Amino acid sequence: NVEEETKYIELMIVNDHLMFKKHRLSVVHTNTYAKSVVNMADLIYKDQLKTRIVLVAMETWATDNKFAISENPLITLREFMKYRRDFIKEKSDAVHLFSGSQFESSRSGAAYIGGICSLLKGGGVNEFGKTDLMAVTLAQSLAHNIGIISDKRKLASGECKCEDTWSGCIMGDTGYYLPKKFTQCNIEEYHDFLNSGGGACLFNKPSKLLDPPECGNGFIETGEECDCGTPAECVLEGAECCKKCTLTQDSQCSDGLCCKKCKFQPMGTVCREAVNDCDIRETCSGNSSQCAPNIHKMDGYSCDGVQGICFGGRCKTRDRQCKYIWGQKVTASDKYCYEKLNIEGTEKGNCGKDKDTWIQCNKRDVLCGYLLCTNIGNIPRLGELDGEITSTLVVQQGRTLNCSGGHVKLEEDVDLGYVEDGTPCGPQMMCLEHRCLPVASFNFSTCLSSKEGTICSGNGVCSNELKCVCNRHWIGSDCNTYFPHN
Ligand SMILES: *[C@@H]1O[C@H](CO)[C@@H](O)[C@H](O)[C@H]1NC(C)=O
Ligand SMILES: *[C@@H]1O[C@H](CO)[C@@H](O)[C@H](O)[C@H]1NC(C)=O
Ligand SMILES: *[C@@H]1O[C@H](CO)[C@@H](O)[C@H](O)[C@H]1NC(C)=O
Ligand SMILES: [Ca+2]
Ligand SMILES: [Ca+2]
Ligand SMILES: [Ca+2]
Secondary structure, X not given: OOOOOOEEEEEEEEEOHHHXXXXXXXXHHHHHHXXXXXXXXXXXXXXXXXXXXXXXXXXXXXXXXXXXXXXXXXXXXXXXXXXXXXXXXXXXXXXXEEEOOOOOOOOOEEEOOOOOOOXXXXXXXXXXXXXXXXXXXXXXXXXXXXXXXXXXHHXXXXXOOOXXXXXXXXXXXXXXXXXXXXXXXXXXXXXXHHHOOOOHHHHOOOOOOOOOOOOOOOOOOOOOOOOOOOXXXXXXXXXXXXXXXXXXXXXXXOOOXXXXXXXXXXXXXXXXXXXXXXXXXXXXXXOOOOOOOOOEEOOOOEEOOOOEEEEOOXXXXXXXXXXXXXXXXXXXXXXXXXXXXXXXXXXXXXXXXXXXXXXXOOHHHOOOOEOOEOOOOOOOOOOEEXXXXXXXXXXXXXXXXXXXXXXXXXXXXXXXXXXXXXXXXXXXXXXXXXXXXXXXXXXXXXXXXXXXXXXXHHOEEEEOXXXXXXXXXXEOOOOOEXXXXX
16 A cells, blocks of 8 residues: 555755764765764664655755754754755755754754655754764654654553663653654554655655665665665565666566566556545556656645645645544534634634734634634643633534634644644635635646646646646646547
């Protein structure tokens, strides 16, 4: 499926000036030192998460810092992503900072939850340490980007516990020594993220790793035609056609989803099925051994049947937001809970807070204010609960409804407990800054179309790469030309 495939995190590392000074003003030392940290973090990911950490790019600030590095990991993280948005022009799944300085709290790093593949959120910041120690810091930073959050609700209950206390578990920063393993709960959180449609950019295999070619690492570099895993794992797949990184007589490929016996899989063979209704299925090219780079519908397509809208391959509904914060057993409150409590302007329903006084929602923006769920807990899966749980009770001519809420903080700016931006609030209307606005107020980019009022000439789907994925028998960058082939 999608959780059985090997994932690949194309990673870029940025070393600041203090990291450069930690290695005697030597560029070669810093870069090889950072490769070691990545290499060890790869070994942790390689087995447990069925995911590989591939270093694709790196830069070192030999002269000075481009921005003011902060003692607060979150402030540094935010300013670092600003730098990478405006200055970093190399392609990567995630960009991480290697800081020579030290942060205030025992938190050795900060990274955005479910951040990968994103331009503004795909990255983290990591403080200096030992090679073995920093690899753990990177392993938990990338885990956050990857969707592994370490469920607080299950932790407080005692549901999820570190079974192998082999110097503890990684997402258990509760104790600090040398955590080498993820909990089974961690693996599930990662699977759920991939099945949710997250991490689409984690499905392509790199070729030229920033290190000289070596036959037998499982990566097709310069000079070598094929490459199976290693002589041991090679026997399972590829040993029949690959020999000394060279193809045999009857072979087009060695290993991959689009490689049957030792030959290619016919063009149009389903190699990857859609994980959700935001996703697009992938077909074998008939030309490559790899299953084509994982792509999905562009941001704007409705999901869950008009109830949600796709963003980054993930569906945004109020019910899914309630489950993300409070647990799978929790459901979103009735639309009436919103329609009545949010116009009041109390702690029990509002459009935000001003000067210690709650803002009462307009009747138009009633689904974009305070997030209301049904039977809520008192310990969120992530973030910090800021205060007490809201719980009012409204009657509806025979149906007594339970509307509940809570203020869950991640950033000092970002607050979960209010309807997330992009969530549908009506036909062709979404939430933005606690306001129900038309789809135009988001100015989505579009694919090419040669028919008035259609997406991809009405014969295709607009991908997140802003390319037209045509239906059968239709060709062209706009899917406007009919070309059947049988
Ligand atoms: C491989 O085949 C595809 C057709 O699926 C074609 O578009 C592409 O140009 C080919 N690439 C090479 C290098 O032959
Ligand atoms: C309403 O939900 C709260 C938690 O959100 C719960 O404590 C309370 O018992 C519920 N009330 C009813 C009527 O079930
Ligand atoms: C789309 O709407 C306007 C365009 O003038 C502006 O706020 C911005 O470009 C876009 N808004 C967002 C949320 O990015
Ligand atoms: Ca990638
Ligand atoms: Ca190799
Ligand atoms: Ca896909």
